[PDB]
């Protein structure tokens, strides 16, 4: 698959914040969702907040405590998300490409994909 444009991604870093983002298929349209789930063997995986198509409801914590996520851009449509404090340990591959699922929703058990795929083999666990 062809890699999609991004403005920063990969393993998280301690302290501060990272505006994880990935280019979306649509252009100048913000009525789309997004998912940042990373698939990899083992228990070294943490749930990641999801954004619905409507965009009125933000993250699994609801808009009551969340912050608006930018999903519109001029040069290239992109989605911006804010990352909460999490453990630096990570072992799953990162591949910002075309998403395998487009029916974004508010579900929690739902994941980006079941199996793994092509991507960078960066790991800081083992």
């Amino acid at each position: 698959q062809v890699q999609l444009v991004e403005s920063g991604g990969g393993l998280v870093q301690a302290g501060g914040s990272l505006r994880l983002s990935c280019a979306v298929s649509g252009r100048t349209i913000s009525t789309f969702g997004m998912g940042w789930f990373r698939q990899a063997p083992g228990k070294e995986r943490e749930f990641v907040a999801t954004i619905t198509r409507d965009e009125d409801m933000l993250l699994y914590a609801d808009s009551v405590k969340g912050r608006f996520t930018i999903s519109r851009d001029t040069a290239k449509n992109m989605v911006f998300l804010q990352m909460n404090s999490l453990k630096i340990e990570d072992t799953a591959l990162y591949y910002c490409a075309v998403r395998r699922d487009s029916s974004w929703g508010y579900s929690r058990q739902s994941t980006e994909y079941d199996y793994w795929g092509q991507g960078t083999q960066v790991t800081v666990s083992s």
Binding site: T52, D54, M57, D62, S103, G105, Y106, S107, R108, Q109
Partner: protein, 49 residues
């Protein structure tokens, strides 16, 4: 907690009487409990399935 079982014996109902207690969290503590796929819970208010 009444007249219910697992997936093999779930209970089936339909009536325009009320909504079960799951909407308690849908006022100020709307967690991911309302697992919606493809659509957002807000769209339910505007229109239904």
């Amino acid at each position: 907690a009444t007249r219910f079982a697992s997936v093999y014996a779930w209970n089936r109902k339909r009536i325009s009487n009320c909504v079960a207690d799951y909407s308690v969290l849908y006022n100020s503590a709307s967690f991911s409990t309302f697992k919606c796929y493809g659509v957002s819970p807000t769209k339910l208010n505007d229109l239904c399935f």
